[PDB]
Amino acid sequence: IDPKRFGKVAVLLGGDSAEREVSLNSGRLVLQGLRDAGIDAHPFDPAQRPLAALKDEGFVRAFNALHGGYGENGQIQGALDFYGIRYTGSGVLGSALGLDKFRTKLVWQQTGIPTPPFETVMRGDDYAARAQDIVAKLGVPLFVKPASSVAVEKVKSADALPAALEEAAKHDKIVIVEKSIEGGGEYTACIAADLDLPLIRIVPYLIPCGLDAAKEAEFKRIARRAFDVLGCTDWGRADFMLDAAGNPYFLEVNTAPGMTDHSLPPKAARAVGIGYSELVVKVLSLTL
């Protein structure tokens, strides 16, 4: 794994967004991580420098250490594709779709990645027909919310649901109707190439996460399936929760995880004896 098979590497850090400082700190650590492994890596701040200078200066690849704005929403990914520059994290579709919480859940639910159950209704639909089918699938009580401030309406009886769909659709073109579920723990699965990273339990944090080895293995596999259906590369976090019976429900992905000393992927890696430098190289290797 000869460093320099990587060629000239740009670390994208800084940017225009509100998280500029976290990006700057995170990027500097990534840069040092790459240099410790003998990789020819250089900082590149797209807020300070024209993006076309990447191609003009002979950069072949980029480690994306940006957060927020154009860094994670498909914009910089599309631009970098345009200039022939390879980059860590996911492409245009996976990055854009990953930020779109609503459409991520639609893709998941249609493909059998478990996610909190729900149905959608639009202005003009046959509310009586949709109500009957929704009650059959989801039971009651149900929560009605716009899909794009507003309070969640709780609907307690099958018979009252048509009217709630009618009333919600007057204000919002698209409405989600969600099943009632009990919170039974929140968790995150870090994915970094082929590395075996342990789950983390979030306590509003914890390794070991407190799940048994069979469940840990099963949830990590589902996490990778959840990335696959979105068109995401294997770099990121998948957040999920359990109900009281221990069933998993996936909530969202993050395709641009933190890389500060206290961020989750370095913490997970440390927990199983994997150092910061090894982590960053493994992430960059996905661009080879």
Return the domain boundaries, the chain: 1-88, 89-114+182-288, 115-181
Q: Answer for the pair 127, 166: CB distance below 8 angstroms, yes or no.
A: yes
Tokens (6 digits) for 208: 């070991």
Which CATH architecture best describes the domain 115-181? 2-Layer Sandwich (3.30)
Type of residue at 96: A
CA-to-CA distance for 285 and 90, rounded, in angstroms? 13
Q: Which residues are annotated as a binding site for ATP?
A: 135-187
CA-to-CA distance for 239 and 201, rounded, in angstroms? 10
CA-to-CA distance for 93 and 227, rounded, in angstroms? 12
Nearest residue to 103 (alpha-carbon basis) of 78, 74, 82, 133: 74
Strands 174-179 and 142-146: antiparallel
Residues pairing with 143 in the sheet: 154, 178
Q: Which residues are annotated as a binding site for Mg(2+)?
A: 239, 252, 254
CA-to-CA distance for 55 and 284, rounded, in angstroms? 18
For domain 89-114+182-288, is the CATH number 3.90.1150.10? Answer: no
Distances (CA, A) of 77 to 108, 135, 244: 23, 41, 40
Q: Which residues are annotated as a binding site?
A: 135-187, 239, 252, 254
What's the CATH number for 1-88?
Answer: 3.40.50.20
Experimental method: X-ray
Neighbours of 209 (CB within 10 A): 19
Residue holding tokens 């599309």? 78
Data resolution in angstroms: 2.2
Residue holding tokens 């914890």? 206
Q: Answer for the pair 102, 108: CB distance below 8 angstroms, yes or no.
A: no
Strand segments (E) across the chain: 8-12, 40-44, 61-64, 86-87, 118-122, 142-146, 153-155, 174-179, 186-192, 200-202, 235-242, 248-254
Q: Answer for the pair 241, 183: CB distance below 8 angstroms, yes or no.
A: yes
Please count the CA atoms within 13 angstroms of the CA of 283 that sit on its side-chain side: 34
Strands 40-44 and 86-87: unpaired
